[PDB]
Amino acid sequence: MMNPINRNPKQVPFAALLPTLMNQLDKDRALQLRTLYARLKKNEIPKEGFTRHMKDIVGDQMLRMAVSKLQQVNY
């Protein structure tokens, strides 16, 4: 407590999630993700929509694993 250290959580961007996921996805799935991102860029779908849709493509398990590896932090 002599020298308190403040730490804050950090999250990786979706931009870095695409290539990681695309590498773990088949070309057909990767193409779906690619066009899905385009929808996000065009703002035709909400961020929640993007996340939800992404989960439907890679899966919740892959989604949490992808960010876990990118974060590379157990906690």
mmCIF file of C-alpha atoms in Angstrom:
data_model
loop_
_atom_site.group_PDB
_atom_site.id
_atom_site.type_symbol
_atom_site.label_atom_id
_atom_site.label_comp_id
_atom_site.label_asym_id
_atom_site.label_seq_id
_atom_site.Cartn_x
_atom_site.Cartn_y
_atom_site.Cartn_z
ATOM 1 C CA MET A 1 0.000 0.000 0.000
ATOM 2 C CA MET A 2 3.104 2.171 0.121
ATOM 3 C CA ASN A 3 2.899 2.627 -3.625
ATOM 4 C CA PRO A 4 -0.543 1.708 -4.904
ATOM 5 C CA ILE A 5 -0.757 0.411 -8.441
ATOM 6 C CA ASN A 6 -3.878 1.073 -10.458
ATOM 7 C CA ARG A 7 -4.693 -1.348 -13.234
ATOM 8 C CA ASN A 8 -7.523 -1.328 -15.725
ATOM 9 C CA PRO A 9 -8.798 -4.046 -18.002
ATOM 10 C CA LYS A 10 -8.097 -3.984 -21.708
ATOM 11 C CA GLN A 11 -9.957 -5.622 -24.548
ATOM 12 C CA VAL A 12 -8.698 -6.418 -28.013
ATOM 13 C CA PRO A 13 -10.415 -4.816 -30.971
ATOM 14 C CA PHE A 14 -12.711 -6.673 -33.342
ATOM 15 C CA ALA A 15 -10.308 -5.748 -36.121
ATOM 16 C CA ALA A 16 -7.741 -8.126 -34.634
ATOM 17 C CA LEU A 17 -10.449 -10.733 -34.060
ATOM 18 C CA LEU A 18 -11.345 -11.093 -37.731
ATOM 19 C CA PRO A 19 -7.983 -12.450 -38.911
ATOM 20 C CA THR A 20 -7.699 -14.744 -35.925
ATOM 21 C CA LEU A 21 -11.172 -16.098 -36.490
ATOM 22 C CA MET A 22 -10.805 -16.230 -40.250
ATOM 23 C CA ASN A 23 -7.726 -18.394 -39.785
ATOM 24 C CA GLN A 24 -9.805 -20.725 -37.601
ATOM 25 C CA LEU A 25 -12.751 -20.594 -39.966
ATOM 26 C CA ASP A 26 -13.328 -22.378 -43.232
ATOM 27 C CA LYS A 27 -13.231 -20.265 -46.378
ATOM 28 C CA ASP A 28 -17.026 -20.365 -46.577
ATOM 29 C CA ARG A 29 -17.347 -19.214 -42.967
ATOM 30 C CA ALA A 30 -14.551 -16.689 -43.406
ATOM 31 C CA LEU A 31 -16.356 -15.212 -46.404
ATOM 32 C CA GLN A 32 -19.502 -14.899 -44.300
ATOM 33 C CA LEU A 33 -17.466 -13.144 -41.627
ATOM 34 C CA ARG A 34 -15.880 -10.907 -44.254
ATOM 35 C CA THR A 35 -19.248 -9.756 -45.603
ATOM 36 C CA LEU A 36 -20.557 -9.546 -42.046
ATOM 37 C CA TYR A 37 -17.797 -7.060 -41.250
ATOM 38 C CA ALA A 38 -18.765 -5.133 -44.371
ATOM 39 C CA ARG A 39 -22.284 -4.818 -42.972
ATOM 40 C CA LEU A 40 -20.775 -3.504 -39.759
ATOM 41 C CA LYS A 41 -18.631 -1.021 -41.691
ATOM 42 C CA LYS A 42 -21.704 0.140 -43.595
ATOM 43 C CA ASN A 43 -23.409 0.376 -40.202
ATOM 44 C CA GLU A 44 -26.259 -1.739 -41.497
ATOM 45 C CA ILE A 45 -26.129 -3.725 -38.289
ATOM 46 C CA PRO A 46 -25.470 -2.694 -34.726
ATOM 47 C CA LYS A 47 -22.360 -3.556 -32.736
ATOM 48 C CA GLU A 48 -24.487 -5.966 -30.736
ATOM 49 C CA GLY A 49 -25.783 -7.320 -34.036
ATOM 50 C CA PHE A 50 -22.234 -7.770 -35.243
ATOM 51 C CA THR A 51 -21.207 -9.542 -32.051
ATOM 52 C CA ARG A 52 -24.330 -11.710 -32.008
ATOM 53 C CA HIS A 53 -23.967 -12.544 -35.688
ATOM 54 C CA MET A 54 -20.264 -13.264 -35.227
ATOM 55 C CA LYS A 55 -21.104 -15.625 -32.373
ATOM 56 C CA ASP A 56 -23.490 -17.468 -34.660
ATOM 57 C CA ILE A 57 -20.665 -17.941 -37.163
ATOM 58 C CA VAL A 58 -17.649 -18.838 -35.026
ATOM 59 C CA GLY A 59 -19.603 -19.998 -31.991
ATOM 60 C CA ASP A 60 -19.559 -18.777 -28.417
ATOM 61 C CA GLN A 61 -16.772 -21.217 -27.593
ATOM 62 C CA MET A 62 -14.578 -19.905 -30.393
ATOM 63 C CA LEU A 63 -15.553 -16.349 -29.570
ATOM 64 C CA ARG A 64 -14.415 -16.581 -25.954
ATOM 65 C CA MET A 65 -11.321 -18.582 -26.901
ATOM 66 C CA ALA A 66 -10.338 -16.089 -29.590
ATOM 67 C CA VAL A 67 -10.429 -13.134 -27.214
ATOM 68 C CA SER A 68 -8.816 -15.198 -24.473
ATOM 69 C CA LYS A 69 -5.821 -15.958 -26.675
ATOM 70 C CA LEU A 70 -5.640 -12.415 -27.980
ATOM 71 C CA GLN A 71 -5.805 -11.005 -24.467
ATOM 72 C CA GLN A 72 -3.458 -13.764 -23.307
ATOM 73 C CA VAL A 73 -4.528 -13.166 -19.720
ATOM 74 C CA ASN A 74 -5.916 -15.954 -17.558
ATOM 75 C CA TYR A 75 -7.957 -13.451 -15.581
#
